[PDB]
Every structure is written in C-alpha cells, then in structure tokens.
Design a protein around this ligand. Structure first.
Ligand SMILES: Nc1ncnc2c1ncn2[C@@H]1O[C@H](CSCC[C@H](N)C(=O)O)[C@@H](O)[C@H]1O
Ligand SMILES: Nc1ncnc2c1ncn2[C@@H]1O[C@H](CSCC[C@H](N)C(=O)O)[C@@H](O)[C@H]1O
Lengths: 314, 314
C-alpha cells in the first residue's frame, strides 16, 4: 500500500537513483537490466528511459499488476517485463535471458541491515550478473557517533519508573534494548564520527553476513554526558557511473525515510574532551525469530573497564 | 513492543480509564473484573487499586510475562491473575470463576472498527458477564463532517499524475481508496457534524456487525470546496460509573493515538452555505482479506444525483 508512496516521496533516495541511471545513458544503452524489488516500477522506468534493451523487474508484491499498467501508460511495455514472484522461486528469466549486465536494487533497511533484501540481491548477483557487471548501488558505509539526548531519554526510558503511580521499571530494560528509528539533530552530536562497516556488493559473500563483527572508535569533543549512540549509512553507486553518485541518511543532510538509528545507553557516559570511545559491534540474526536483528556492543572509554550492552531490532 | 508505550502515553485515553475506574471504588470493591487485552496491565492495576477482589487479565501477547512482574512489583500478585491466550481458547477462568461483574476493554480501532477487538469483547460478554454486569467502556459514537484539505489532497493524490515526468495516474484510484489516519485541524471543518453510528456494548449482537448500514446528514457552513470527509468517535463509560466518563478522538480536543480518519473525495464538492449532504455509509469486512474493512459511501447534495465512492482500510 502506502509503502511505495514513502520511497517515491523520499527525494534524496530517488534522485540519487535517477542521477546514477539517467546520467549514464552510455552505460545503459542496449543492455539487459534486472530490477530487484521493482515496486511501482520507477527504477525500471529510469533504466528504460536511459536506453536499456530489456528491463526485468521482480517483485513478490501484488503491486506488480498496477506497475504493469504504469509501464504501459508510459510506452515501455516492449522493454520492461515484470515478474510477480520471489527471486528465489524464478526458474528462468524471460526471453531466454541467462545473464544480465546491471542489477538495480533498493535493498537497504533500517540500520542498513534490518529487514534488508541484501541476501536476495547477492543471490540474484550470483545467478545472473555477468562477470564484470554492475550493481546499482554497490557500496554502503555505516557511521556511528555519540549524542546528547537527555530530554528524549527521560521521556522514552525513565518514564517507566512511575506510571500513574505504579512501578513499571520491570519494562525499562526492554525499552533500552530496542533501538529507535528517528531523526537526530546534528547539534546533539558530541563526538567525531566513526566509519564502522563497509558493505561492497561486488565482493561480499552470503556467509560473510551470518555474523558481522566490526570495530568503532570515536572521540569526545565536549565536557558533556552521552546518552546514546546514533548510526546511519551512506550509499554509493561506485562501479559503473561515469562519476560516482552518493547519498547519505545521516543527520547533517536532508532526511530520508530511513532516518537514523538511536542506541540508548543503559548508563550515561560522562565525557571529557579528547576522551576516546572504542569497541566492537556484533550484528547477527536473532535465533528465535530470524526477522529480528541482534546488535551487541562492547566498548571502553580511555581504556576503562568494558561496558557491554545488547540490543534487538524487532 | 512499543505498541504499549503508545497507549500509556495516550493521556486522553488512559486518564479516561483511570477516572472511570478509580473514581468508582464503590462499584469495584470486592468484585470480579475481567480485563480483555490487558497488555502491560495498567487497567488491571487500576481495578485492583479500586478494590476488586479478583482481576483476570487476558492477552495473547508475550507481554504477559513482563506484565506479571509489574503486577508483583506493585504488590497485587494475589489479586491480579494474567492469562496468556486468545479469549476464544480459554476453557475456564481461574479460581473456579464462572461469572464476572465487570469487563474492561480497550477494543476501539482506527475508525472505531478497523482491526478492533469488538467481537472478542462481545464473546467474553456472552460467556462470562453476569446479568446486569458492566462493560468499561460501553458506548461509542461516530461522527463525520466535511473539510477543506486542498493542500494535502494535491500532495497525496494528484502527486501521481506526474512522477519524475512519468504518468503514474494508474495508481490514483488506489491512493483515493485508502482512508488516511491523520490529525485534521478543526479550522478545516466546513460542515456541521453528523452522528452516524452508535455502538452499545450492553445490547449489540455479533451478527449485527456482519454488515453495518447507517445514514449521515450534515450541512455546509461556507462557500468553499470540500475535498474530504473526516470521521472520529467518542467513547463513554455510561452504565456503572456514578457520573459518566467520556473522551473524544475528534479534532476539537486534544489528540489521541487514534487521530482522525480522512476519506478523500474523488471529485471535490463545491458547497454553498446551507447545502445539505446526506447519504449512507456501509461498513463490512473485506471478502478476500478479513483483516480489511470495506467502507462504501453514497450521498447527494441538495438532492442532486447520487455520488458513490468505495474505500478499503487495509
Ligand atoms: N525476496 C523478494 N523477492 C522479490 N521481491 C521482494 C523480495 N523481498 C522484498 N521484495 C519487494 O521489494 C520491494 C522493495 S520497495 C522498492 C520499491 C521501488 N524501488 C520504488 O521506488 O517504488 C517491495 O515492494 C517488496 O515487495
Ligand atoms: N483475541 C484476543 N485475545 C486476547 N488478547 C488479544 C486479542 N486480540 C488482541 N489482544 C491483545 O489486546 C491488547 C490490546 S492493547 C491494550 C493494552 C493495555 N490496555 C495498555 O494500556 O497497555 C494487545 O496487547 C493484544 O495482544
């Protein structure tokens, strides 16, 4: 339903795709393009307008029926073919196509990896992408920093101490364990930013994602309390475009429907300028429900004792 | 997860329940209370504090495990018993309880009836409520009026005419068929209000809800275009409380998590003062997906020809 309105109205995201595709007619002319999760078909339309010989869109949604009408209303029924189905249940691609030159996908989830189609795209890549072929986009980088969020933490967390006079503190750890998807103001940031993960769709393998372990390090700029870490991702169309096309979901630039991801700390960190926060973040699917994402943090401040907190995005 | 944060933070709703319960200790003292869909247990806690002998909460959610801890942390483990389960799959109530004096429930959905627990409450009533017993709340009234919403209609509807130069108009009827749950400003209202439905939980029967047919009539106050109808409901704890307790989800009062429900019109209505809009609204569950709600409108303006529009809440 309205899920497609949201992405189309996400101007930062859609223009990034539009520019990467339409500015590179030379790369798209007469090629075979596969759009994974085509939805309403806007990306397919871009690729057709850019000169592709064939655009094959896959989507498991019933949106497909109306996407075909949109393709026809814009004159592309001979170029764009849409398939209702999960990518995993496609025997052959139509028209006897066996390899494709370009895969377009919008796979990125919240916190990049939450309920993402990454695995589906990697399988499509392994089954169909010709050697040397291109993934639009193909590189995503995650960043993390520390913020001051005293107001929002007292409202979302310490609310549970006294609810109409009752003690609801038994719920507090469950409130803390859920990362919040929300916009953060950049003036709340009180540390440098740390690139802590890069995902390269040209090289990554499916088993690399079973469990992600990574490191992060950032530096306090203020005498201040830190109540949360905030994380976002930048996405780059790097291989293929004549010039690289980029967009960010971070707080320093116009918002996107992914917002940012806020990880509330159990205990506020009192930070002095030049204090160093460094640790590891481990990301993996939840054992009891595979749609859920387990995120585990272990870090220190100036070598202090290890602080550890576990989150579940569900 | 955070669904319970939302209702607790809904002050209009929670205070209405708190006042109806805690202001009527005389009615609750030494009685047996059933809370349908108890969640975190706040309503159970109110009923216990009001003097109930026994409070039985039912919830099909795993929230129950933490709700039991909250009950214990507030000293009520001997009064409040919680059952994980659907009401439809409960053999006997515990402690050999066979009848109950009061049913509390928060059954109201969006547009009152969308994904509501009404049917579950009526079954609990028929199985367990003693003759003459009370339902908290027991009366809900729906209201509807016409609004000016030219800005939001051009953004949510005529957006589809031209999307990055492409014609997406094939989607426009699907955008119009989805009612929007959103807040409306009262100064957008340009008609009188029409009570079009009342639900009396003391008397209503399950088969009465298979298909609801009702009438509405309201009157234009301005020379203006009408782009949508807006609907909300008021809820009343009428039988039981010493004085009636009420709350509204309408635009003239503080917002609630139910917001209001906006029905965009296919064709704007040009209204003159004292123009009369009258018709029928038919509400029933969708044949192909029973979670969905079909809403059909047929109306006239000053006896003009019949205008009809169909909506699906899904
Ligand atoms: N395994 C899978 N196989 C096929 N489609 C999938 C899939 N997993 C998710 N999808 C589909 O991928 C889409 C991603 S939303 C992307 C929408 C489109 N690019 C636009 O801008 O409108 C969804 O519509 C969903 O139905
Ligand atoms: N058929 C059914 N049987 C038992 N519980 C149900 C049910 N249908 C819905 N529910 C439960 O009813 C609850 C309604 S939300 C009400 C929450 C509570 N009154 C509070 O203020 O926190 C949900 O938690 C849901 O799990």
């Amino acid at each position: 339903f309205g899920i497609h309105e949201e992405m189309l109205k996400d101007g930062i995201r859609t223009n990034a795709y539009k520019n990467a595709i339409l500015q590179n007619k030379h790369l798209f002319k007469d090629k075979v393009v596969l759009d994974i999760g085509c939805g309403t078909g806007i990306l397919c339309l871009f690729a057709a307008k850019a000169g592709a010989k064939r655009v094959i869109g896959i989507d498991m949604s019933d949106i497909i029926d109306k996407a075909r009408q949109i393709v026809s209303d814009n004159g592309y029924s001979h170029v764009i073919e849409l398939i209702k189905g999960k990518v995993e249940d496609i025997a052959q691609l139509p028209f006897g196509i066996e390899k494709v030159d370009i895969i377009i996908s919008e796979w990125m989830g919240y916190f990049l990896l939450y309920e993402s189609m990454l695995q589906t795209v990697l399988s499509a890549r392994d089954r169909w992408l010709r050697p040397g072929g291109y993934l639009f986009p193909d590189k995503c980088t995650m960043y993390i920093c520390g913020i001051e969020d005293s107001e929002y933490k007292r409202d979302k967390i310490d609310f549970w101490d006294n609810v109409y006079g009752f003690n609801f503190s038994a719920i507090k750890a469950d409130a803390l364990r859920e990362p919040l998807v929300d916009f953060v103001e950049s003036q709340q940031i009180i540390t440098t930013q740390s690139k802590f993960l890069e995902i390269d769709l040209n090289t990554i393998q499916p088993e690399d994602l079973k469990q992600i372990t990574t490191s992060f390090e950032f530096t306090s700029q203020y005498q201040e309390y830190c109540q949360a870490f905030v994380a976002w991702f930048d996405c780059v169309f790097s291989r293929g475009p004549h010039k690289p096309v980029e967009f960010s979901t971070g707080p320093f630039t116009e918002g996107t429907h992914w917002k940012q991801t806020v990880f509330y700390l159990e205990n506020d960190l009192p930070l002095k300028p030049n204090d160093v926060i460094k640790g590891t973040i481990t990301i993996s699917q939840n054992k009891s429900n595979h749609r859920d994402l387990d995120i585990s943090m272990k870090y220190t401040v100036n070598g202090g004792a290890v602080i550890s907190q576990d989150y579940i995005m569900r």
